[PDB]
Amino acid sequence: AQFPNTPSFTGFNTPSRIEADIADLAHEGTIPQGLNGAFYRVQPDPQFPPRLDDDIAFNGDGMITRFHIHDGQVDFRQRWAKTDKWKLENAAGKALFGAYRNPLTDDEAVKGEIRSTANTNAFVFGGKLWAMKEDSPALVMDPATMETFGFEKFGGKMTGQTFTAHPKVDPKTGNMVAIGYAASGLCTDDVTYMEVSPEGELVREVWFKVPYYCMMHDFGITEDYLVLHIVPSIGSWERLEQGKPHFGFDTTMPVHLGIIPRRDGVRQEDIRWFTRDNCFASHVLNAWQEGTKIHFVTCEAKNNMFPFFPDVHGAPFNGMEAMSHPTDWVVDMASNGEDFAGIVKLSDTAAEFPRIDDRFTGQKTRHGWFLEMDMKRPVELLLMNCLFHKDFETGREQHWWCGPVSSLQEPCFVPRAKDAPEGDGWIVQVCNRLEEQRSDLLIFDALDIEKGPVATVNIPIRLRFGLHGNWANADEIGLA
Ligand SMILES: COc1cc(C=O)ccc1O
Ligand SMILES: [Fe+3]
Fold it and tell me: CB–CB of 327/346 below 8 Å?
């Protein structure tokens, strides 16, 4: 097929569309024997040229990559997430769905069909692989064969239209905790709060409303709460009619933080809202309670981080104000009123794609890992050029730079053992070797990243820009 000659489909964004298997990837260093499981990640990767003249990265069909690490080797498997969209377009031999989150640009033949590209997260839970996209139910897949089952509607018990791509697992119960925004239709202010049992049952679905419709991409959990930030990357049917990108950022609107009790029967009046001045924040490191306080650690920037979802008043993109920093939003459930108790910048390092040791989700975490944008580094080819580790107890920061002709994808923490202390284990992440037109899988000792990866695993396929990824042990994915 003939693709557009635009930035979104050329250079590093050239279509790939590869399904493949490789056993025992070539490598340098020592692949830890203690690793026995798989790292899953997803790349948007268009099956077909777009209906319109161009498209954005976030709109490519989900392609799932798995690195099966066992016995000191890494195996590679890559398969399409076969969404209803993928299936319909494959049968038709052409694109049928149009622009990002814009049904007004779809072929009439797919009116009412689920638009998901399943391209934002590759998550393992309850014996299934979840290929996730926040405008639709999640797509479920076999974690071992990587065949596709279909969309998870919980047998029809789910009443909302959508399911998050940023699920959290409650370590106390083992439940998956989820939201679904635009729950009653596009651009609506309805949201569902959901929990899924380890057995796969939808055990709670609570409807509530938020102050305004916006991209509710991420959220936090604590022991007793779901913590939902409301940030004004807004959308509307009018934007779609005016031919605009679905979302745009409004610098004039306030930011809110909603505290939802994680219990049956929660009502709107049970939800508490705090309010602060405008800023941008997308990803959540973690959240926790401490006394009467809630700590909500996010990567906060002064202004919009999505150039493709532009300022609603026409301002050009401000790269400097797009620099995000780990920041603790502190609210006090024992205060009166809506003010935050604190907004505390936690590092001067510019950072995004925050990760923790997920075994400690919703508890106070000593450690965090991030992708860092070090604008002081040489570049010989915004730029994510360092892995960054913060020890929040000691304050110590570690940085590893991938060099001047590379960039990095989201890290993932892998525990050494089920009983290991927080952070005792490894970091895995994809590295884009931009000049060599190829990719590496890097494995680090998670509490000593600054010495560099202990293994560099060569991938003889150029991987595309990725979103979120996750590790599962072999006995959780049918590979033991
Ligand atoms: C890859 O798709 C998306 C990614 C994000 C943020 O990283 C937000 C909405 C999306 O649809
Ligand atoms: Fe995300």
Answer: yes
Resolution expressed in Å: 1.8
CB 400 within 8 A of CB 448: no
For 326, the 3-state DSSP assignment is strand
User: Biggest alpha carbon distance in the chain?
Assistant: 60
Tokens of 312: 């609603």
Angle 383-250-465 from CA coordinates, rounded to 5°: 25
Tell me which of 61, 132, 134 to substitute to probe ligand 1's pocket, judged by most ligand atoms within 8 Å of the beta carbon: 134
Question: Is 468 known to sit in a ligand binding site?
Answer: yes
Q: How far is residue 463 from each of residues 19, 66, 140, 201, 299, measured CA to CA in Å?
A: 12, 12, 22, 34, 26
Residue 138's contacts (CB-CB under 8 Å, 6 or more residues apart) are 118, 130, 131, 132, 151, 152, 163, 165
* Two structure tokens written together for 163: 């399911």
User: Of ligand 1's atoms, which has the minimum distance to the CA of residue 44?
Assistant: 1
Alpha carbon distances (Å) from 87 to 49, 61, 93, 148: 15, 11, 10, 11
Report whether 152 contacts 205 (CB < 8 A).
Answer: no
In degrees, rounded to 5, the angle at the alpha carbon of residue 92 between the alpha carbons of residues 90 and 95 is 75
Residue 377's Cβ-count burial label (10 Å; 0-12, 13-18, 19+) is middle
3-state secondary structure of 251: coil
Say if residue 283 carries a ligand binding annotation.
yes
The verdict on whether residue 389 carries a ligand-binding annotation is no
Q: Residue of the nearest CA to atom 10 in ligand 1?
A: 58
Q: Residues enclosing ligand 1, CB less than 6 A? A: 44, 58, 119-120, 217, 467
Select from 294, 157, 137, 299 the least CA-distant residue to 226. Answer: 294
Tell me how the structure was determined: X-ray
Cα–ligand 2 centroid distance for 273 (angstroms) = 23
Q: What's the chain's Rg over C-alpha atoms? A: 21
Tokens 């505290």 sit on residue: 259
Q: Give residue 285's identity as a one-letter amino acid code.
A: L
Ligand nearest to the CA of 468: 2
CA distance 301 to 119: 25
Cα gap 389→370, rounded to integer Å: 6
Q: Which 8-state DSSP code applies to residue 145?
A: T
Strands 293-301 vs 367-372: parallel, antiparallel or unpaired: unpaired
Question: How many angstroms is it from 218 CA to the middle of ligand 2?
Answer: 7
φ, ψ dihedrals at 294, nearest 5°: -115, 130
Rounded distance from Cα 247 to ligand 1 centre (Å): 11
> φ, ψ for residue 266 (rounded to 5)?
-60, 140
From 354, 345, 358, 346, select the one nearest 372 (Cα to Cα): 354
